[PDB]
């Protein structure tokens with residue numbers, strides 16, 4: 001029974017070390033994915049707002065040519 | 069064997085890096101070209117200095133070190149400086165555009181473009197090791213690379229190296245030399261992210277080193293060069309255990325056992341003595357009792373806090389030079405008799421001691437006197453929490469208004485990471501309070 | 509290296525632009541031919557920031573010269589320093605501007621705009637590591653204001669992750685009789701609050717009052733005003749141009765100076781004021797209303813952030829003591845909820861004619877006084893529709909004036925919000 005317990009201890013040590021590596025790897029994967037999509041969302045909104053300025057700037061130039 | 073790989077991240081880490089290696093070369097009799105005349109085993113060996121230096125067949129002794137910065141200026145000075153021959157070019161890694169004092173750019177935006185390259189070069193050093201002990205990480209809390217890139221690196225090292233030991237030397241920010249209003253944000257973010265990944269971290273308060281330079285070395289307005297030479301001595305005393313051998317040398321891992329009662333309580337306070345000018349050290353022999361007693365004066369600490377208003381959970385004393393056991397035993401017995409040091413009730417009142425006989429060295433044209441003997445005390449005291457408290461307060465002041473947060477949100481971070489990081493620091497401050505309460 | 513790309517637009521923009529290049533060229537030891545004749549390696553170390561390197565060891569400003577009038581760009585070529593600029597960087601119009609923002613932003617400016625971008629694109633593409641862009645202009649005219657802010661917007665599309673920096677000259681009735689400038693300025697601030705990272709507020713009301721009251725010039729010229737603008741511009745770009753730790757690039761400066769993204773309008777200052785001191789005096793003069801290039805009393809608000817650059821051979825211990833002194837004695841005027849919000853740099857190399865000098869860069873809530881002044885003038889004519897046909901004629905709606913007014917007054921509210929906030 002003492003030999004089975006010695007085995008169980010060394011397996012627990014290996015398993016906890018492996019679980020720590022695993023969670024570090026998952027937590028880091030979800031952080032970097034979350035950051036990428038957040039940053040792309042912020043630049044998309046920046047340029048989609050700058051493109052609304054281009055639509056408005058052509059409405060101003062076409063409104064001029066509707067005073068002819 | 070028991071090799072250590074040193075990693076120097078960002079300006080602070082790199083420049084403290086230069087001072088440390090320069091100092092190690094002078095201590096081991098290694099020249100700026102890497103040749104070491106006193107070493108008769110050419111090509112390799114397992115002498116104590118081989119924990120920090122590998123060896124080429126050509127007789128060159130090469131630091132087991134990677135230097136990383138997201139910006140080429142500081143490392144370019146290493147690449148063309150006095151010690152350029154010491155390092156292989158692959159050990160000196162640089163990007164183009166820095167992290168702009170933003171944790172988010174160091175960890176996510178800019179940092180991710182160079183992280184796989186850095187692990188590659190670290191792996192090349194690891195594959196040269198017969199029995200890798202672990203890593204020493206040098207970095208600022210305040211900078212964007214020092215905070216953000218170091219965090220990323222630490223997370224990745226835990227994945228790629230399991231539980232190999234990882235020690236930090238972390239530069240804690242001071243108003244006298246700071247270059248960023250957001251340093252408190254970066255300090256809290258990196259401390260939170262790194263806490264689970266670091267086995268032992270030595271904080272170096274720049275304000276403390278600044279004061280020691282002013283007060284003890286008569287330096288008017290200290291520069292990084294001044295600060296760094298003194299930091300190097302303290303780092304040298306801590307690593308001395310690994311780099312030398314001797315009958316009374318206690319290894320850094322043994323001090324670690326006494327210093328870390330619980331995994332999160334891994335921030336030892338370092339105190340160093342004597343820090344004295346050549347002019348004052350003339351016709352003045354400072355005894356073992358004198359320098360030991362100087363470890364309990366808070367003016368000589370690496371972090372500004374007061375251990376006399378806290379409780380010790382460990383006390384380790386790392387002597388170097390002309391020091392013999394009789395003198396050390398007598399000095400520590402005086403500390404006991406006089407008291408002035410309360411331990412928590414759950415901790416034995418021990419003083420774990422080591423001695424290396426090689427005396428302290430100084431760099432040419434430095435401020436420090438060459439003394440016969442020196443000591444670095446490493447203590448675990450509840451008072452170190454004061455450093456977190458000061459920083460956590462500055463964090464709160466700005467974060468209640470969300471001041472500067474848009475710079476972090478703009479690089480992909482959420483407010484959730486800030487408040488999560490601050491909760492972990494609140495929990496850390498409570499841990500240092502809890503361990504200091506007496507048992508029922 | 510960290511390259512900046514300079515743009516000067518309109519009459520005012522090209523005057524202060526030209527004089528900026530005179531002053532910093534003298535400092536780096538560059539003569540009008542573009543050759544180095546100096547004595548110090550520190551002059552060249554960060555020369556790539558503003559100058560391209562050419563064949564035959566020469567140095568060319570990374571500068572793009574723009575205006576809708578062809579005349580001002582002849583006068584740039586004329587006055588020595590002028591044969592230094594790159595000939596194909598000169599992008600000129602024909603019609604001229606007419607102090608009409610709509611013309612500069614929508615019609616006449618839009619036609620010329622792509623010719624400017626092509627030059628910007630050529631300069632930007634051979635940069636090793638581009639920091640971003642520096643525009644000099646006035647907000648009272650038509651080209652510098654309307655086409656300048658169009659330029660800014662069009663450069664953000666193609667370089668969204670670079671820094672956009674402006675030196676924006678604000679209109680004063682004391683300097684210009686043009687009635688329509690409150691409209692031009694308000695419309696320009698509407699653009700700047702959204703599309704720039706950091707804007708230095710060069711205020712002609714402040715510049716005239718320094719020249720008339722302090723300097724005692726009974727009839728001040730544009731050249732008298734621009735001597736003050738060029739002193740400021742040398743001063744606030746010192747950290748970008750020489751080696752150092754503090755605010756050494758445009759992004760690091762922004763991160764130290766801009767706590768909230770809309771609040772990026774700085775209030776520069778300078779001592780000594782001159783025409784053509786000890787560290788305690790320099791330090792006192794910096795935080796005093798008389799020395800500010802915006803017409804705002806800093807003791808009517810609080811400073812969110814501050815940068816202080818001291819130039820000359822002085823004691824760094826003395827500078828540290830005085831900057832601590834000034835914060836202790838003026839603590840109320842620094843927001844308590846941003847700790848360590850005053851940063852200090854010291855540069856050994858002084859400017860021309862002085863042996864020591866100080867430059868000040870303040871993000872002050874008192875800057876609202878500038879925007880209120882402009883907003884009172886704007887609304888004085890907008891409540892009775894005066895001269896709107898100039899703008900409606902080019903196709904603008906009456907609602908774009910309302911939206912511009914409303915955003916500038918929001919900006920005033922936001923300055924007041926953070927002025928009144930506390931640590932509690």
Ligand SMILES: CC[C@H](C)[C@H](NC(=O)[C@H]1CCCCN1C)C(=O)N(CCCCC(C)C)[C@H](C[C@@H](O)c1nc(C(=O)N[C@@H](Cc2ccc(F)cc2)C[C@H](C)C(=O)O)cs1)C(C)C
Nearest residue numbers: 519520523681682683684685716727728729730731732733
């Ligand atoms: C009564 C006319 C004078 C000349 C005018 N004052 C006013 O308009 C007053 C009176 C009514 C109440 C309020 N206004 C502002 C004036 O003194 N001005 C404005 C000029 C308006 C120009 C017209 C065409 C709209 C001053 C500028 C004027 O004196 C000039 N300075 C220069 C000038 O600086 N020339 C330099 C070169 C230069 C040329 C053109 C530039 F745009 C800039 C520099 C060289 C000279 C030698 C120097 O170094 O000072 C050219 S014209 C202001 C600073 C108040």
Ligand SMILES: Nc1nc2c(ncn2[C@@H]2O[C@H](COP(=O)(O)OP(=O)(O)OP(=O)(O)O)[C@@H](O)[C@H]2O)c(=O)[nH]1
Nearest residue numbers: 078079080083166167168169208210211212213214
């Ligand atoms: N002791 C010491 N501190 C330094 C040194 N260089 C910078 N610091 C401190 O480190 C912090 C600034 O961070 P840096 O290390 O310069 O920044 P970085 O890691 O290069 O990050 P980025 O520049 O943002 O990419 C401030 O608190 C400085 O006071 C140094 O050589 N020695």
Ligand SMILES: Nc1nc2c(ncn2[C@@H]2O[C@H](COP(=O)(O)OP(=O)(O)O)[C@@H](O)[C@H]2O)c(=O)[nH]1
Nearest residue numbers: 518519520523646648649650651652679684733
């Ligand atoms: N400080 C200063 N202000 C100027 C200068 N030239 C014009 N201004 C001001 O700029 C505004 C008109 O802008 P201007 O550059 O002439 O218009 P543009 O033709 O559209 O570029 C007015 O408020 C003038 O007082 C100058 O050289 N220095």
Ligand SMILES: [Ca+2]
Nearest residue numbers: 107109112113
């Ligand atoms: Ca050997």
Ligand SMILES: [Mg+2]
Nearest residue numbers: 079139166211
């Ligand atoms: Mg850096």
